[PDB]
Write a protein that binds this ligand. Structure first.
Ligand SMILES: Cc1cn([C@H]2C[C@H](O)[C@@H](COP(=O)(O)OP(=O)(O)Oc3ccccc3)O2)c(=O)[nH]c1=O
Ligand SMILES: Cc1cn([C@H]2C[C@H](O)[C@@H](COP(=O)(O)OP(=O)(O)Oc3ccccc3)O2)c(=O)[nH]c1=O
Ligand SMILES: Nc1ncnc2c1ncn2[C@@H]1O[C@H](CSCC[C@H](N)C(=O)O)[C@@H](O)[C@H]1O
Ligand SMILES: Nc1ncnc2c1ncn2[C@@H]1O[C@H](CSCC[C@H](N)C(=O)O)[C@@H](O)[C@H]1O
Lengths: 237, 237
């Protein structure tokens, strides 16, 4: 989960890591318009703190979000006060309308547990996309590209708070176990320690392809992508 | 205390902070020889991991140490295998010989609790110095120069281990409370968290001067010094 301090620290952590949501959103908007020139709407699934949405709103007249963490969604709603952002689950939701694009960014799809959940999410994405539109999924690493033992450490400061974050990634069966620790310090705060752990599924490329195909989407993989993990696109029909 | 992982991390932490024990030792050796041209021996009290001693041994035919932490002293003895390094307490020890210089570096004197302990340590230092020699004490901050709320953060890597350290300093009556947290990570280790807390006494300049005088030493303060905290010297007579 992504609650409490995890959620409150998320944007600062990713700013310090140099994640450029503005450039990623401009790239996404152009990718959508490449397939759907008249595209006017976008649904960002697992939208987190709504960073992509805030920039995509400059480009699309209607942007909406779906997010299962209330604490992440609270930050997203503050950031996007004029947008409709829904609380719910990517495996089984129904908004009653379709969008030019359905996006699921930054490997959020890896929080699904196996093939049945992956297939269910892709079917929901196809159920919410228009016929000339596009479904965009940024996968987690494939098993052959996963680096067990990886350690990342960084420190960022803002507003008088210093945040140090360290992550460690290992292989646990068919998933990555990521452990993340934080030290959060400030002149009055003192030092507090926080920890979190995620299990992120190592779906193969073929497993993603199967989920897209079973949802009625034609699937393409582009290597590299916003995070080194590539990007899948899918078109209905 | 300075046991376990605190001791094992100490040198790497201070290397990453840029502490230059080689230059500090060359400066100390020249300071001693300025007062005692024929100086041939030095005792480093609260010698920690023996970094100063290792360099001072290149300059003085006899160097010895005194240290109360067995874990710090174990590292010092490995680093200085040909030197006699004593286990004991700066407030009350007796080596049965005197030295050209008695040094106490990097604010170790701030681990003493009040005037009686400070006076007792300075008397022991004077009891171990030769008549043309010098006692050198690097103080902690004086109250007027202490910065409450100070946060320091740094990360260093060596040998496959990543160490992040954060400290926070506050005023607690007549002492600084320093809280220190570490995250120590590696590909097999995973991530471990450690914490420590010290109370370091905020002696005034006059209190140091009184301790030197009561030990029979004439005292001089030089601002700046190896750590910004200045340096006291004292000469017998
Ligand atoms: C080059 C490289 C990295 N990784 C893995 C190793 C590690 O699992 C991840 C990089 O670690 P971190 O930078 O902390 O990850 P995020 O940016 O996603 O931050 C969060 C991670 C988890 C929860 C929340 C945020 O990619 C690989 O598997 N292969 C690679 O070639
Ligand atoms: C400029 C400045 C700093 N400090 C205080 C604030 C803080 O108490 C200290 C600087 O913090 P850190 O760099 O972690 O200290 P060390 O290098 O001694 O490492 C250890 C500290 C304690 C135990 C072990 C190691 O000096 C002041 O009081 N005045 C100042 O002008
Ligand atoms: N079943 C599910 N349904 C909806 N959101 C989910 C979910 N499982 C995980 N999430 C959300 O997936 C997100 C992963 S972090 C990625 C957030 C965002 N897309 C960004 O690029 O920053 C979290 O916000 C988490 O709460
Ligand atoms: N009463 C006492 N007697 C001897 N050593 C003491 C002591 N109280 C604290 N110490 C030692 O004081 C040291 C402080 S850290 C400074 C170590 C060393 N002089 C250096 O410059 O790196 C620790 O090694 C601690 O164990």
């Amino acid at each position: 989960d992504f609650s409490g301090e995890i959620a409150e620290l998320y944007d600062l952590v990713h700013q310090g890591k140099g994640k450029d949501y503005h450039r990623e959103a401009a790239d996404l908007a152009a990718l959508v318009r490449r397939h759907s020139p008249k595209a006017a709407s976008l649904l960002d699934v697992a939208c987190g703190t709504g960073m992509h949405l805030r920039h995509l709103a400059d480009s699309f007249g209607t942007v909406e979000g779906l997010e299962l963490s209330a604490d992440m969604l609270a930050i997203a709603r503050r950031r996007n006060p004029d947008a409709v952002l829904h609380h719910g689950d990517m495996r089984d939701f129904s908004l009653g309308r379709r969008f030019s694009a359905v996006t699921c960014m930054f490997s959020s799809i890896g929080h699904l547990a196996g093939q049945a959940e992956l297939d269910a999410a892709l079917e929901r994405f196809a159920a919410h996309v228009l016929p000339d539109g596009v479904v965009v999924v940024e996968p987690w690493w494939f098993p052959e590209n996963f680096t067990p033992g990886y350690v990342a450490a960084g420190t960022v400061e803002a507003g008088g708070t210093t945040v140090t974050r360290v992550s460690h990634s290992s292989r646990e069966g068919e998933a990555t176990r990521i452990e993340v620790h934080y030290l959060v310090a400030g002149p009055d705060r003192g030092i507090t320690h926080h920890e979190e752990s995620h299990r992120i599924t190592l779906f193969t490329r073929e497993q993603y392809e199967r989920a897209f195909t079973a949802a009625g989407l034609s699937v393409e993989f582009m290597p590299g992508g916003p995070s080194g993990r590539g990007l899948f696109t899918g078109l209905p029909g």
